[PDB]
Amino acid sequence: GAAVAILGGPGTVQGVVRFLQLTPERCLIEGTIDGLEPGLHGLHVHQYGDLTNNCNSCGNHFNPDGASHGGPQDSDRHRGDLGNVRADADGRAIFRMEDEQLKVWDVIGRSLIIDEGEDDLGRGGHPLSKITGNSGERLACGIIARSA
Amino acid sequence: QNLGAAVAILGGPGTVQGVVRFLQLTPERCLIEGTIDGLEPGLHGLHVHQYGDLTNNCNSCGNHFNPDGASHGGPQDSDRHRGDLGNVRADADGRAIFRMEDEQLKVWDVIGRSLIIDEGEDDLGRGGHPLSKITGNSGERLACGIIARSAGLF
Numbered sequence: 001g002a003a004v005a006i007l008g009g010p011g012t013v014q015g016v017v018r019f020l021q022l023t024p025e026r027c028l029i030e031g032t033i034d035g036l037e038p039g040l041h042g043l044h045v046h047q048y049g050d051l052t053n054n055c056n057s058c059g060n061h062f063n064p065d066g067a068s069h070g071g072p073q074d075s076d077r078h079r080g081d082l083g084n085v086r087a088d089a090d091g092r093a094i095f096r097m098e099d100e101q102l103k104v105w106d107v108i109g110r111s112l113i114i115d116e117g118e119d120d121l122g123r124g125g126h127p128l129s130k131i132t133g134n135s136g137e138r139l140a141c142g143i144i145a146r147s148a
Numbered sequence: 149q150n151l152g153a154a155v156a157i158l159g160g161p162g163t164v165q166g167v168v169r170f171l172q173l174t175p176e177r178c179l180i181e182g183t184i185d186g187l188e189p190g191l192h193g194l195h196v197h198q199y200g201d202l203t204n205n206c207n208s209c210g211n212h213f214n215p216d217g218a219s220h221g222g223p224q225d226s227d228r229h230r231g232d233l234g235n236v237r238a239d240a241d242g243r244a245i246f247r248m249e250d251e252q253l254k255v256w257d258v259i260g261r262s263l264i265i266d267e268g269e270d271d272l273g274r275g276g277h278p279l280s281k282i283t284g285n286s287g288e289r290l291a292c293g294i295i296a297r298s299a300g301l302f
């Protein structure tokens with residue numbers, strides 16, 4: 001399957017992220033997000049795509065396996081933990097990745113969200129490291145939709 | 149509880165907008181409730197389309213959600229699309245408030261897809277119009293929302 005997520009939020013920060021399930025156990029994720037402060041910004045899929053209350057109603061990190069926060073490449077990680085994304089000097093974050101635990105059929109209807117700052121991939125030894133990665137505040141989210 | 153919920157915030161090319169929530173009471177009953185404002189008073193077709201891609205506004209949503217390859221019809225017709233929710237009447241203040249059940253539309257089907265409100269009435273495939281058995285000829289799409297997974301108000 002194929003998907004897309006139109007990000008946005010309070011003021012700056014907004015972009016587009018598409019998902020394409022190339023095969024039954026590996027997914028391609030490509031997207032661009034402008035308006036971000038140069039530097040790393042965590043990226044995660046949250047349980048819901050309900051933006052009624054903006055990104056506050058998006059629920060928490062999509063985590064079916066009941067794991068703990070981790071890195072994309074980590075094993076013990078939330079299915080929705082896409083780790084970080086780097087916003088170059090221009091404040092533009094462009095990326096492409098092949099996460100193989102996050103499937104298009106498992107995240108449609110949900111949401112993609114970028115945070116204030118860097119995700120410490122559950123290794124920051126902060127009360128929130130193992131929970132969110134202490135990525136800070138959610139500044140942009142989009143509902144992961146079905147696409148052609 | 150196993151009550152699946154989905155919410156669809158409507159936004160578009162015009163004034164029209166609202167929120168429609170979906171609730172899968174039982175596997176055969178899906179409560180659909182919503183309020184859409186900014187509509188001209190009168191009937192307005194409501195359908196679930198196959199894609200939720202709003203990258204090209206309400207155009208990239210594709211067509212009405214129609215797995216069974218049926219033709220367009222009213223919400224109560226057997227020969228209809230799964231996403232055919234039929235009409236929705238916006239009152240004098242240009243507001244559409246509606247609550248209804250649909251036993252053919254399942255929450256788990258429409259997630260990720262989109263809810264669209266049309267310019268005009270849905271002839272429910274009986275207009276004898278080239279588009280009747282396709283779109284019900286409900287006119288143009290003035291607003292659409294991406295059906296999203298939701299907690300649901302309990």
Ligand SMILES: [Zn+2]
Nearest residue numbers: 061069078081
């Ligand atoms: Zn996480």
Ligand SMILES: [Zn+2]
Nearest residue numbers: 212220229232
């Ligand atoms: Zn139809």
